[PDB]
Design a protein around this motif. Structure first.
Motif: not given
Lengths: 46, 271
Positions: B74-76, B78, B95-96, B113-114, B116, B127
């Motif tokens: 998962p990655a936000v 930033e 990243y997570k 937003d999310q 991956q 994505n």
RNA sequence: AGGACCGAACCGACUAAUGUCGAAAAAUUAGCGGAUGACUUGUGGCUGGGGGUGAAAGGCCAAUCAAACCGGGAGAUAGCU
RNA sequence: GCUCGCCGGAAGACCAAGGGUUCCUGUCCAACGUUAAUCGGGGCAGGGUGAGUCGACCCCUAAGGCGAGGCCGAAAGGCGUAGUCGAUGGGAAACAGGUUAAUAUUCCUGUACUUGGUGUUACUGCGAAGGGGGGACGGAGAAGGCUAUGUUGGCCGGGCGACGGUUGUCCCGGUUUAAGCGUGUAGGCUGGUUUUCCAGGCAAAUCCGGAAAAUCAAGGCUGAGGCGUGAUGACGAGGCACUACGGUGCUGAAGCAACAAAUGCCCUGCUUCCAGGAAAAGCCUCUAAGCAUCAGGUAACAUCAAAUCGUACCCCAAACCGACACAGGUGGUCAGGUAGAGAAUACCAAGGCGCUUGAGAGAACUCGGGUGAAGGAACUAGGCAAAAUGGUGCCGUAACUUCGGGAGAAGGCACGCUGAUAUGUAGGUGAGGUCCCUCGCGGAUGGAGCUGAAAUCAGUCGAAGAUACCAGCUGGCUGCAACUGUUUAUUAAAAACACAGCACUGUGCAAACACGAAAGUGGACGUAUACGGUGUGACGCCUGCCCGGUGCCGGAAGGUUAAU
RNA sequence: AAUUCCUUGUCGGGUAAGUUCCGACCUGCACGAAUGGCGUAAUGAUGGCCAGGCUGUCUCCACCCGAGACUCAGUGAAAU
RNA sequence: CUUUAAUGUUUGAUGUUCUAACGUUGACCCGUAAUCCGGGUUGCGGACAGUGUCUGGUGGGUAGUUUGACUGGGGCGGUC
RNA sequence: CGCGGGGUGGAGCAGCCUGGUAGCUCGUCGGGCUCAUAACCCGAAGGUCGUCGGUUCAAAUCCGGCCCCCGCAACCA
């Protein structure tokens, strides 16, 4: 006027110096001819 | 958003700036920055290989992870950043596991937003996944050519290619120029399209506006003398010759494409 | 904010006068343009002779350039003086 | 030696560059100096350059260079990895006074600081070419807090003065003090601390990053200047006393306050916008391979080392570059008084010079200038040159327009000094007193003193009040080109070039294209909203017809067709 | 017309007098639509023309102050 | 002789498929702290591409040269 | 001043290069179609080939002089 000789001994020895002359093949021929003509002050040095 | 400046000065009366408050107004992530001493169009021998290039402003290098090697993580997003070297925006992605990486900023993306990657990622802009796992007719960018190379196609502002079909092993794409190039199914692509589409609407306005950007003034061939260019000479800008390059190669209509090693790839050529 | 305005430093060099065997192998004086920008500048490097470089005049490349300087071909050749 | 004059953001004082004893003293005058010369950057002889803290050498790198193997190339050699050099960059540490004919942040006096080695005592796990932080950075603008420094007053000392006044609100001179340490302020930055876990940072990690709980609300970091200390030390105007009359020796009062205020510092800040603004080491710290009664690291004390070289003088010029003792060119720092917006300019302070040919004459003529009756461009290729307008505030300002401009359009009014408003106002700054407190460089209140525009009125002086230097000519029509910018260095600066914008076309990336025999690079660590070339040259209105000729592109059946 | 040879074309304005200027007539030797055409605010050490102001440019020069020119002393070239 | 038919035989021109040549300026590892290079794995192309030899074409990008004489000066015209 | 081209029914252009034979369109005249004109349809006529001369069996053609028209040239000091 602004004549064509703004002295800087470092630049004088990085383009006409002993080690700069020795850096190449043709450069070695320069030091050879200087000794051939029998010159005292071979290249520009101290 | 764009802005047409009020004519407060000669030369300023035509400029158009593309602005977006989404961009972080400060210094970027330092650990992923390396120097970039320019060249000005000079090679190993120092001769000017390409003209009109040089000058400009000192720019740092932002390493962009094109391999997208992180998998099922998962990655936000930033914060979106401004990048000198490119035309599009670059988003600082966290990243997570705690590994920060820069990526090309697509359109459908915001600070929070999310996303991956991998072969299991869903169908949402940002994505990344191989082209054999993407539906026919969709939109993608940062498309690779060789499996695991990184990405060659569509990386600029407001740029996207459309997968036209998928005949088994080969994945046929309709490139940005308008090609029909087959690319292997192992190549990854990034869904959605690259943001900041109004880049093409940007008007500089000033001569120096291109100077600090890196562009040096071009000298027309008709203005020069017969020695320095195939054109030139005569009394009063006469021409009487077929327009060519400074080296005699015919311009304004002349295919210079000579590859043949990859002509099995291109099905239909550019319009 | 401004390739913004007036105007020193600073850079550039349009007009006239003097100078022209001058103080000086392009200068001075009285007036001039830019002067936060495509600005200017010190130091240190880099590109080279049928090449380099050039906001392009065939300008500049150590006062020498429509192809530099040094030596060697070479006492070149010359129906010419 | 006494007057006159000149520069004074330099013609002053200091450094780099580059010169190489040109610096000083004695002595000498043939030659050098555009003249004489007991004079000198000229000859001869001698003296002088003293460093742990300045710079370089050193550590660490950038542009770029070289380059073990290696790629490639007739040879030469070209390119480039590991590495290694290369500042104009970053990285440790000193200031004040005195002293020489010449050098002194180097010598001396006083007071400190910096980095290592060794040894000892007391504790304790240390440790890489590896990881993370730090180093570490853009332009412009406004504001706040101060300093260098200057002015005035107080204080101290001297004088009361060659023509009238001058013991008085008078005059002149001085009123200087650093580095470091202690304190940690105005201001600026960031919410700390404890616990658990982790595909993360080539391996590891207690370090950083991230994901969750917790407890408490501040802690910590950074930082000019001020106050003490440094320092009953030095310096200090002026006297006191010996002279080879150059100067030496002795002694020595006041040494505070207020205001104004930097381009210097806090600022390697803060805010905003955009074209988005080096690297590595020193340093801090965590661990790997290992080593552990060791070794090392932290702290304190003692002692030793800090090596080599430059250090003179010149440094906007008779010493550099210009053939010369040449009106030229040459980067950086300090940079005062009055008037003034100012580093303009004017006259001066400090300091330093009168430029190395003069003495008379006062013709034409020549150069630099001053003024000029009447007329006022009739001059002339042409208003070229001169003349003239010239500063600040207010009033006022058209065609046209891209709505910014045009425009400081044009054209006009008021400007000195004295007094009064006000024994100097609005304002700025700001001690004492009073009060409180998480008691310090604090906060309110408080208002002395200092300092200080402009406006208004009245009065008076000259022909003239921006009285000097300094310091726009303006308006109309129009060709060309958009504009700032760039070029024929040294007869052409423009209507030429560039320009943002527009268009055509080439290129799918081991890209087109360019340099290079090749390798390898630039293009780009970018990728069609990108890059190369060509053509035109803002913007507004548009940009019509022709494919015969030449070229290019697309299609190839047939004719022709090299080598084999 | 930065293009017009013929030409100083014709007409109107400006001047007492206008081969230049400005506005038009089209008889375009031989303008012309990115070797871009026609216009344009601002801008120009640009070309042309006119007016005001201003003055020695000039009518027609006059005087004066300085540095040379002349003389004396010292040094001492040059091109030909 | 012409038209044609099955087969053996001789090669050429195309289509398709494969991996061993070769390329690999794809991923991984080691020599090795090294984005060079080389070797080993593996993927993708593939008998293409590329290089050499011979050769057709294009080609002022580049190089070496011609570019007549008389002529009531030369050029044009004209002559030889 | 010279080089090249051209002159043809009433008009505009071929035919000339390689001599015995002159065409196309419009126009004109007359008739027809319509109540009338034009257009449309049908038939016929019309050329001293710029001028003079010549070589030749024969000249619009080939050559020479002259006239007129058109384009080019009329230059470097």
């Amino acid at each position: 006027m602004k004549r064509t000789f703004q002295p800087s001994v470092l630049k004088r020895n990085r383009s006409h110096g002993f080690r700069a002359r020795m850096a190449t093949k043709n450069g070695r021929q320069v030091l050879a001819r200087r000794r051939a003509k029998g010159r005292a002050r071979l290249t520009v040095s101290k | 958003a764009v802005v047409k400046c009020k004519p407060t000065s000669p030369g300023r009366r035509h400029v158009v700036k593309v602005v977006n408050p989404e961009l972080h107004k400060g210094k970027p992530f330092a650990p992923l920055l390396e120097k970039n001493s320019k060249s000005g169009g000079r090679n190993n021998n120092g001769r000017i290989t390409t003209r009109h290039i040089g000058g400009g402003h000192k720019q740092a290098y932002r390493i962009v992870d094109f391999k997208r090697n992180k998998d099922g993580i998962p990655a936000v997003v930033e914060r979106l950043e401004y990048d000198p070297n490119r035309s599009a925006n670059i988003a600082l992605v966290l990243y997570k596991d705690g590994e920060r990486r820069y990526i090309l900023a697509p359109k459908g993306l915001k600070a929070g937003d999310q996303i991956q990657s991998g072969v299991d990622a869903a169908i949402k802009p940002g994505n990344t996944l191989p082209m054999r796992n993407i539906p026919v007719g969709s939109t993608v960018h940062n498309v690779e050519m060789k499996p695991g190379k990184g990405g060659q196609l569509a990386r600029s502002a407001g740029t996207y290619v459309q997968i036209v079909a998928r005949d088994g092993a080969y994945v046929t794409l309709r490139l940005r120029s308008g090609e029909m190039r087959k690319v292997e199914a192992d190549c990854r692509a990034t869904l959605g399209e690259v943001g900041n589409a109004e880049h093409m609407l940007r008007v500089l306005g000033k001569a120096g506006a291109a100077r600090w950007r890196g562009v040096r003034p071009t000298v027309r061939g008709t203005a020069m003398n017969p020695v320095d260019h195939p054109h030139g000479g005569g009394e009063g800008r006469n021409f009487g010759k077929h327009p060519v390059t400074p080296w005699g190669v015919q311009t304004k209509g002349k295919k210079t494409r000579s590859n043949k090693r990859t002509d099995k790839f291109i099905v239909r050529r550019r319009s």
